[PDB]
Every structure is written in structure tokens, then in C-alpha cells.
């Protein structure tokens, strides 16, 4: 699995669908991280790939 830091959005005016990581508080482009809008409706807390590297205990939490 490649590092996905390139999926991070640091642009103030970006209008792309994006989801916030609850582990590092960075914004991630949804298409880049492979999460559709429909799936994101059922996500309680997203944990990005780099956060789940840092703590392999972590998993995205669904609802």
C-alpha cells in the first residue's frame, strides 16, 4: 500500500468532496482515498492510511 499523503487537501478554497481524518485532523480527497459519498454517510470517524500506519490498532469506524 503506497503512502497516501498526496491525497491531503491543504487548499483553502477546494470544492472537491473531502473527509476529515479524526486521527490527524487533515482533510483528504474522497476520490483519492477511495471513499464514495454514499459510504461516507456511514462513517463515524475516518482514520487515514498514515494514521493507521502510526497506530495499527486504528480502523475507520462506521455507523
Amino acid at each position: 500500500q503506497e503512502d497516501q499523503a498526496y491525497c491531503i487537501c491543504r487548499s483553502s478554497d477546494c470544492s472537491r468532496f473531502m473527509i476529515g481524518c479524526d486521527g490527524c485532523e487533515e482533510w483528504y480527497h474522497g476520490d483519492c482515498i477511495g471513499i464514495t459519498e454514499k459510504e461516507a454517510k456511514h462513517i463515524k470517524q475516518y482514520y487515514c492510511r498514515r494514521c493507521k500506519k502510526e497506530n495499527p490498532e486504528l480502523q475507520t469506524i462506521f455507523r
Partner: peptide, 9 residues
């Protein structure tokens, strides 16, 4: 989750 700018179609 915290999300932004969904197409919401």
C-alpha cells in the same frame, strides 16, 4: 464523519 463539498446528488 466531518465532510465537505459533497455532490449530494
Amino acid at each position: 464523519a466531518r465532510t465537505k463539498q459533497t455532490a449530494r446528488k
